[PDB]
Amino acid sequence: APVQKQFREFHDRIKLAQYDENQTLRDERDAVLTAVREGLKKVFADRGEAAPTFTPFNQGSYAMNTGVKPLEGGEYDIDVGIILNIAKDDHDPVEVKKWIRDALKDYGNGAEIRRSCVTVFKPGYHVDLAVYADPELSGGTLCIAKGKENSGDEHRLWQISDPQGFQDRIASKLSGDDAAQFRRCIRYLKRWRDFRFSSDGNAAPLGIGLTAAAYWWFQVSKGSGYDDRDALEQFVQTMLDNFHDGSGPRLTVELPVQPYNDVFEKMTGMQMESFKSKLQALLNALKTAKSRLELHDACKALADHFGSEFPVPEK
């Protein structure tokens, strides 16, 4: 059946407005930056040292206007970049993240140092602070602080990064009503991801991975109107076409900017195979929604993969 009306109602339920349109997100973000700013003051005061300063910038889904509401019980991710006024070559990247961990030791429950960020946990959301060295102090490149505490020297580095170039690639791929479909389809795949995978471990494809995949492979589908079901079917088929056989089947997707890492690299072999099987089933559900005569049956096939916010009309 035609299901464009139900996709659009689904999109209205799952959409979370971007930073520039979301006062709550800006305030929650600014509350953590102020906590960092004040925390650094006390951490460095008590060492009789000068506090380092930073310039923030918006990152991730609320920057790129690809944001979704979490499922009941889930958390949304506020992503921000902080560019510390340091030369990368003067500091261990782990030790810089420890500044930000120590600055936030009294903000909610406190922070943890993850491989690519310092995360602070609040009721219903977390803030991932990506920590960068200043490009002018650092020889001209923007490098992110990689590595965990007590990690070996090989497992920590200042890694070349281009979060703004990635954001600009996503923004400029399409425009107008075309770009709107592109963003709706990224949001649909994030809700699919939240519904069909556990937040647990690396099993869930990352939002940035799905977004990178859409950058490479999304194709507008429009006729008598936008056809989000057809755009998703083509896009899912194309992702499936790009799995190769190594140890077992893997989908390798480069970030289209520095550092050109495989966005799905952390997924184990078995998580990759499970990822592929769930894509196959989603593709089957997208094809069933086309072929079913009854709107009820078409929409129920989609609700099985997009979850209970996908509307299912009666009869």
Q: Is 105 helix (H, G, I), strand (E, B) or coil?
A: coil
Q: Which residues are annotated as a binding site for Mg(2+)?
A: 77, 79, 128
Burial (CB count <10 Å: 0-12, 13-18, 19+), residue 270: exposed
Locus of tokens 């990152």: 59
Q: Are residues 128 and 170 in the same domain?
A: no
Q: Establish if 13 belongs to a structural domain.
A: no
Cβ atoms of 232 and 186 closer than 8 Å? no
Cβ atoms of 124 and 72 closer than 8 Å? no
Please tell me the total count of domains within the chain.
Answer: 2
Resolution in A: 2.0
Question: Which token pair is 163?
Answer: 């979060």
Among the residues of the chain, which ranges form H helices?
4-14, 23-45, 61-64, 93-103, 163-172, 176-196, 207-217, 228-241, 269-291, 295-306
Q: Are residues 124 and 218 in the same domain?
A: no
CA distances (Å), origin 235, targets 71, 113, 115, 188, 245: 24, 35, 31, 12, 20
Q: Which residues are annotated as a binding site for Mn(2+)?
A: 77, 79, 128
| Cα distance between residue 6 and residue 299, in whole Å | 8
Q: Establish if 6 belongs to a structural domain.
A: no
Q: Which residues are annotated as a binding site for UTP?
A: 59, 61, 79, 114-117, 148, 190, 193, 208
| Cα distance between residue 313 and residue 128, in whole Å | 39
Question: Which token pair is 119?
Answer: 């995360």
Q: Which residues are annotated as a binding site?
A: 59, 61, 77, 79, 114-117, 128, 132, 146, 148, 162, 190, 193, 208, 258, 261
Q: Establish if 8 belongs to a structural domain.
A: no
| Cα distance between residue 203 and residue 224, in whole Å | 38
Q: Are residues 154 and 181 in the same domain?
A: no
| Cα distance between residue 259 and residue 264, in whole Å | 14
Q: What is the CATH number of the domain that holds 89?
A: 3.30.460.90
Closest CA to 240 of 179, 302, 282: 282
- Amino acid in position 128: D
Q: Establish if 5 belongs to a structural domain.
A: no
Q: Are residues 46 and 109 in the same domain?
A: yes
Pairing of strands 157-160, 244-245: unpaired
Helical (H) or strand (E) element with 133: strand 125-133
Locus of tokens 């002018």: 136
What range does the domain containing 191 cover? 165-306
